[PDB]
Symmetry: none
Subunit: 342 residues, 2 copies
């Protein structure tokens, strides 16, 4: 990558590297000649992915264990030698209680940022936020344009007082946690003025290959894979139409945020195009004509929102892509195509 701010062969720390989106960030870093150190709560969580990257990119990926993401000093050992950091602000919804979900998301982000501020070698930091830090997808709402100034401020209070019976409450709690974490990151940058530059990537609904299905199935692509296999969730039919984005493209967006000189203090939207479950089902049926699939879902309406994707397309162009990968190609990355083996 010409004029890269992180030299070729530099080491990037990717937190939560076992996660589905994170594993695509790692893969695109490795694909472009960078070394990666990936953290997980236990070595077992990375063993399969470690096996894949040792085969695919020998000697370029290393597992690092961070048992407590919140503990002070948690990243102080693993960050040493890193020229960049990719922190994925993951949300653990083991509970309905706002404080149990939102606070660890902020706390993990601040901990990673503190570690970077104490490491002079770190030059770039990329935070994985979400489009929910701008808005919750709402079908058939006109006049929604999201840009780098759009913030989901409402989600913070809304997530606190929604009825438990509301089918969308978990989505709102996830939105509050992503919003609060991204806000905390930008506030950290302004208050502490650290030596590194921060960028945020805001993926929407990421569709792509699941490298290790046994552990990565609790992901956007994992849910789509369960649908492919004939599973239907009641929350599935109440999910709003939204934007998809290819998992490779999301990995590229993080790579550009880490290495490209023209990308500083940006919020980069991962929003390729709109979709609903019936477009997914139609693509399943074309890719596997012999397979039986669930029936079409009742109409969920249409997403009329639009996103300012100018820095995203700039990054994609700088990294050699004509534009967004198509949903049909993205879905094919996930489920493959029907083959008659002879």
């Amino acid at each position: 990558i010409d004029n890269a701010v992180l030299p070729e062969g530099s080491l990037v720390l990717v937190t939560g590297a076992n996660g589905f989106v994170a594993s695509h960030v790692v893969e695109q870093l490795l694909e472009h000649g960078y070394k990666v150190r990936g953290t997980a709560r236990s070595a077992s969580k990375l063993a399969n992915l470690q096996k894949r990257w040792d085969a695919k990119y020998p000697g370029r990926f290393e597992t690092a264990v961070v048992e407590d993401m919140l503990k002070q000093g948690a990243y102080d050992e693993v960050i040493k030698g890193a020229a960049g950091v990719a922190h994925i602000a993951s949300v653990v919804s083991f509970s309905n209680k706002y404080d149990e979900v939102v606070t660890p998301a902020i706390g993990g982000t601040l901990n990673a940022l503190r570690a970077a501020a104490a490491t002079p070698s770190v030059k770039r930091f990329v935070l994985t936020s979400s489009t929910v830090s701008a808005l919750i997808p709402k079908p058939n709402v006109e006049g929604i344009y999201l840009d780098e100034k759009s913030w989901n401020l409402e989600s913070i209070d809304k997530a606190k007082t929604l009825p438990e019976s509301d089918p969308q409450k978990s989505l709102w709690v996830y939105a509050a946690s992503k919003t609060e974490a991204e806000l905390a990151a930008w506030k950290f940058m302004d208050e502490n003025k650290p030596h590194f530059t921060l960028n945020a990537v805001l993926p929407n609904y990421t569709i792509g290959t699941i490298f290790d299905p046994e552990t990565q199935s609790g992901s956007t692509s994992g849910w789509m894979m369960s649908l492919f296999n004939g599973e239907v969730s009641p929350a599935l039919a109440l999910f709003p139409p939204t934007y998809y984005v290819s998992a490779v493209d999301i990995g590229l967006l993080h790579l550009g945020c880490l290495v490209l000189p023209q990308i500083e203090r940006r919020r980069v939207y991962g929003t390729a195009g709109t979709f609903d479950w019936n477009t997914v089902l139609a693509t399943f049926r074309k890719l596997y004509p012999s397979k039986t699939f669930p029936a079409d879902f009742p109409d969920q309406g249409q997403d009329l929102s639009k996103f300012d994707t100018a820095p995203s397309l700039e990054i994609l162009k700088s990294l050699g892509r004509p534009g967004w990968r198509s949903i049909e190609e993205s879905i094919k990355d996930l489920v493959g195509s029907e083959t008659a083996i002879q």
Copy 2:
């Protein structure tokens, strides 16, 4: 395609001046049908007659029916009609159960008798309500409404509730709608007439008010009063255009016979409405959010409704923001 009423046929719409009825009329006229619309006086239809004379020239005609109950009331106006849409409206000039419920049944039975004596009438659609199935109550699990659900409870409740009960008028309205729809289905079974009956059961209808001077005593009229800052259970909304489409499908679609068709698009409360008002009119000031009304946990069997909408060219229910926009518009800075 395959409409059971020929294209260009005449439909009699009773009470055509009413808000819901006027949307039934508009959707019939929009689809190339002729409409004869009745009202208690010509004055109640003059404004609507002017609008439909402009929008659909020569396709709407006013007919005066002073007494909806009197025998023979529809004998002239029904002649030549291939369909009848009777809106079972409820006149709440009184709290007395007998004074409210009895005319609702009597008008329905009179319309049905007129259709039974007119061979040209092939389809009859009755405007009932979701209150003929249930009265909305917040935070009740396991409520599923289907075409067998009947609000039998409302009949006794409406007669003996205390006057101080804030819900008493709603229960009397529920009893009138239930008793009228029951009477219609019982008429079909006892008299076995030549035409087919369908019922549309709207919930809270939201849409454009064609004639504000006369149509404001409606669900949409109440919302417009809130929009204008007046404050005078959570339930399902439905777009007024969708309700008109549901009546049209009940009148012309071959796949729809002896059905109770729910107009129930999605749940809402007044604070959802106020939020939509504030977004549509950022400069305008509106009433404060209401105290928590609870949540509507009921679900409706909307299978024939969605079949009708699909057959008439729609992807599904019209959205609440689109429906509220139909009613109040959006803020404009005129240059």
